[PDB]
Ligand binder design. Structure first.
Ligand code: NAD
Ligand code: NAD
Ligand code: NAD
Ligand code: NAD
Ligand code: BZJ
Ligand code: BZJ
Ligand code: BZJ
Ligand code: BZJ
Lengths: 268, 268, 268, 268
């Protein structure tokens, strides 16, 4: 009945009620999934946010740069879902690039310390979470991560786009490892979504030039998309993630599903 | 409950019980869809084959090279499903290339009359069916066609691969037109499936050289696929088509979903 | 000294002094190549046009839809360059799609007779010319064809884009055959060039809607290109074709080189 | 006469006489270029190696992880080529990934410290060198870097492939910056070349499993390539780099040229 009835799914990446992962979690619960949530740093805030989900879910702390958090993660999940139970799904919805790499300054001005932190959080951590959680995943399981199509350079978000190029490559290798467990690994490449951070950047948080370029980027998306694109509505993206978590794409792995209104298939 | 409960879906392309479209139809009916079937030329044979589906379905004749069949198709579908009802889904599972283009002779020996017939049936007809059926499709509907990844040349099936390259391009334009109706258009790129025609070719129907090349092509597929690939089992492909017919990929159009075990994401 | 000193090269596709093939021929002669030209239908006009090239060149008639022209072509070339001499290069600069397929009407209104004629001239003929000329090509030779990136759908030129998708696929198979002769086969994907036909379409030859869409398409190209794009200057495209005809890309075949200002690598 | 007559070109990446950059330098000098070389760490060794080039060239020390080396690089180049002279070309032939990331252990066992060092040297440094050298490059200049097609995952060299995915993305952004100077930026994606490090790995330096997988990877390359692939001969790769350094690909930037025998265009 529900698309994800009886499935146990870990969802990372909630920080506000406009996080893509908040809508992934809401839709997954609507479809019968039992969730375990992970959050970074502001756990009191995240608990208050996730109190608004349709069902209660245990919240675990996870800083993906903390090797001790990752080393203990599987045992804390098993404690939360009960011994003898394993996960059927894992959602990676985690990304960050320090400001020096996202247009507040020229691409050339980002120090490598900043780029390497962003690639750690946004790309390497996808392999990190798979390594931690595959030992407690059931055959037929599914790992899904969030992507923004990096196949062409864009005016702003420069180093973040490089990090997404690395993530797409990491995903293909995670699929190799996950296949030994009977588990699939895929990314959902979403169009632009007006999260709190996104709206701040359009408002000029990283400079007027970066704001104007991203606003024009957003506008062309809805113009290109044959079915349109609503940057204020994350539900179509959440449904696509749930599709990959379900049993209905069983021969897809190492791959990228585009939830972008079809915009990437059109020129003008 | 059922993935496709209450949806009205037209399925083309059944000719034997090993047709990919036979398994698409079976799975769609398992998931609550009400079907209308179309068949080419041997309608008595196709009716006997489809008597084995879990539910009865009206069968309409459709030769996609016959402009009179296409001009009458929408009215015959409306008669079959009842006035005031429209389609929610359309499945194109149609392909053919005369033997001169598929390895029985060198690529250079195929006369254009043969190539143009194959491109008519295998690529142009996707636009033909969309033109005929979009006027009787509901908003939120879905058109799905079958593909075999043509991004690289392969030893055999040469002109058929050229026809698939054309089909992928046709799909992106059909998505533009379908979007005006609130309808999505996508292809499923399947790995090799042992249909009756496929087994005959491996058995040497088009020459020993073509048979040996296709057998080695099949074997590398399961070796590359991180989750494996079973050429004897079309159900994973049928489930993927049903996923695209459902409401769970609502922001994907003009696109290609790979149901190939992940083989196209791996080198060796 | 000259990039193409001593090379014997056949160049198809001249019809006016704004043809891309006119500039290919001019640059090749500047670089020391000895040319044989082929022309379609209006041979008196083409001879008057090519009288303006820096050197005289024999002109042969070639309608690529005429099997008798193709069957005699190799012998007529050998007569023109002398017995015991072979070609080092072949340039395919041929394209056509009847008006019903290029935006004067909706994509769905093109009859297949029109599409099949356009695919014959624009895609199948690349294999046709390779079949005719490979028997009289030297090892180390090069076949080059002209392309317009069809990986995404564009507002107009719809069926012509489908034909380019087919041509890219044909090129990969021609490379397989040409390799047995020690010959490379590649396409140059050019940005928009203001030929006489192009200017007529922008002027509204195929309707005001098609004209406006193509004008906006052209403008975004120069905006995207990191080094800019001058649609009035075919010389950068001609130089790229000469690069592929030379010995300086000796390990590239079945491939596509983009002479588009870098526009296809950028989003906005 | 010479392809690169009068051009001033910096070439990084020589360490042995089997380095790809050694053959790039040799061919560039054969074609009239005046070189400045950069080398990492073992400068006495590199000078003895480059004494075998057809012409003497100044050698400058450059560790791309050393910000002081990069901050002084432009001034040291200007001293070497003379005040009032600028560079016409820059070759990046630099790559490294610590052993934990290249198959001596499972992909999951590479610590991020190792991955981040490899991405620093193999990808970020392409932007680092462009930032340092664009202020002393002439309009019409060219930056070229070395690539190994990372679009699909391969058995070994795992994290190095992720680093190449990042490099391809970096190249598209460097093209944006370089265009303001009238300079192009491109990568050459080479097939496998038997450098000293490559032969050591096939010999089992990183374990027997990694050695066997890379040997089978090499063998399929020559089998796929329509013109063949000779892993013992770097000259076709060097010629392709020289083609991009020349004026004969003037409308290509942000792009990738494949010098791989056509292998990436073929499946089997
Ligand atoms: N336009 C968009 O918003 C958009 C489009 C496509 C893809 N994405 C991707 O979707 C993902 C979710 O981003 P979002 O748009 O929902 O914004 P968001 O700010 O709501 O989510 C980012 C999440 O990353 C988490 N995070 C940051 N550092 C972490 C760390 N060290 N350890 C663990 N978690 C950490 C944040 O706590 C936060 O929960 C990101 O990968 C993003 O790049 C976003
Ligand atoms: N390995 C595979 O079998 C494989 C893999 C990927 C994609 N595909 C694609 O899946 C589609 C279905 O093929 P299949 O493998 O199930 O083989 P199949 O022979 O069972 O189906 C082919 C169908 O095309 C129909 N057809 C032929 N000419 C027609 C015409 N003039 N009008 C209407 N219908 C016509 C046949 O009647 C038949 O029903 C094809 O597009 C095929 O290329 C097949
Ligand atoms: N914007 C552009 O102009 C552009 C951009 C990229 C690629 N191209 C491609 O470059 C090629 C050359 O086109 P062009 O732009 O120089 O326009 P053009 O009109 O000058 O050249 C087209 C050529 O095709 C030839 N041709 C048509 N039918 C033929 C037949 N039956 N047999 C032999 N030749 C025939 C014409 O005679 C003409 O010489 C075409 O393939 C075109 O699609 C053009
Ligand atoms: N099969 C192949 O060999 C192959 C194929 C395609 C691409 N490539 C790429 O070609 C490039 C050249 O590699 P190669 O195959 O000639 O091997 P190589 O070992 O001869 O060259 C590697 C070079 O990187 C340099 N380097 C390492 N660390 C450095 C640092 N901190 N600062 C500056 N330089 C540093 C080395 O000193 C060495 O000169 C690399 O980017 C490689 O990935 C190699
Ligand atoms: O990685 C992202 O989250 C991302 C979001 C974007 C949102 C708007 C425009 C460009 C963007 C590029 C990105 O890499
Ligand atoms: O179009 C197809 O149905 C097709 C099937 C194949 C099946 C096996 C190998 C190659 C194949 C290529 C094709 O284009
Ligand atoms: O094939 C072509 O010649 C072609 C030219 C174009 C020129 C301008 C815009 C779109 C275009 C699409 C094409 O397929
Ligand atoms: O980056 C490289 O140098 C590289 C070389 C290879 C050489 C042989 C096989 C795989 C390889 C993968 C790589 O990323």
């Amino acid at each position: 009945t529900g698309l994800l009835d009886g499935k146990r799914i870990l969802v990372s990446g909630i920080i506000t009620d406009s996080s893509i992962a908040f809508h992934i979690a809401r839709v997954a619960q609507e479809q019968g999934a039992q969730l375990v949530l992970t959050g970074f740093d502001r756990l009191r805030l995240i608990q208050r946010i996730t109190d608004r989900l349709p069902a209660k879910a245990p919240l675990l702390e996870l800083d993906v740069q903390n090797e001790e958090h990752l080393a203990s993660l599987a045992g804390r999940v098993t404690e939360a879902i009960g011994a003898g139970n394993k996960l059927d799904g894992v959602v990676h919805s985690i990304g960050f690039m320090p400001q020096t790499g996202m247009g507040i300054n020229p691409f050339f001005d980002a120090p490598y310390a900043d780029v390497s932190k962003g690639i750690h959080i946004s790309a390497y951590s996808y392999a990190s979470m798979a390594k931690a959680l595959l030992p407690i995943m059931n055959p037929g399981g599914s790992i899904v991560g969030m992507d923004f199509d990096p196949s062409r350079a864009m005016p702003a978000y420069n180093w973040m786009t490089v990090a997404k190029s690395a993530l797409e490559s990491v995903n293909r290798f995670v699929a190799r490892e996950a296949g030994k467990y009977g588990v699939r690994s895929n990314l959902v490449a979403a169009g632009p979504i007006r999260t709190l951070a996104m709206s701040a950047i359009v408002g000029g948080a990283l400079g007027e030039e970066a704001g104007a370029q991203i606003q024009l980027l957003e506008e062309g998306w809805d113009q290109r998309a044959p079915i349109g694109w609503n940057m204020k509505d994350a539900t179509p993206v959440a449904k696509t993630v749930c599709a990959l978590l379900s049993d209905w794409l069983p021969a897809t792995t190492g791959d990228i599903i585009y939830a972008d209104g079809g915009a990437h298939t059109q020129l003008l």
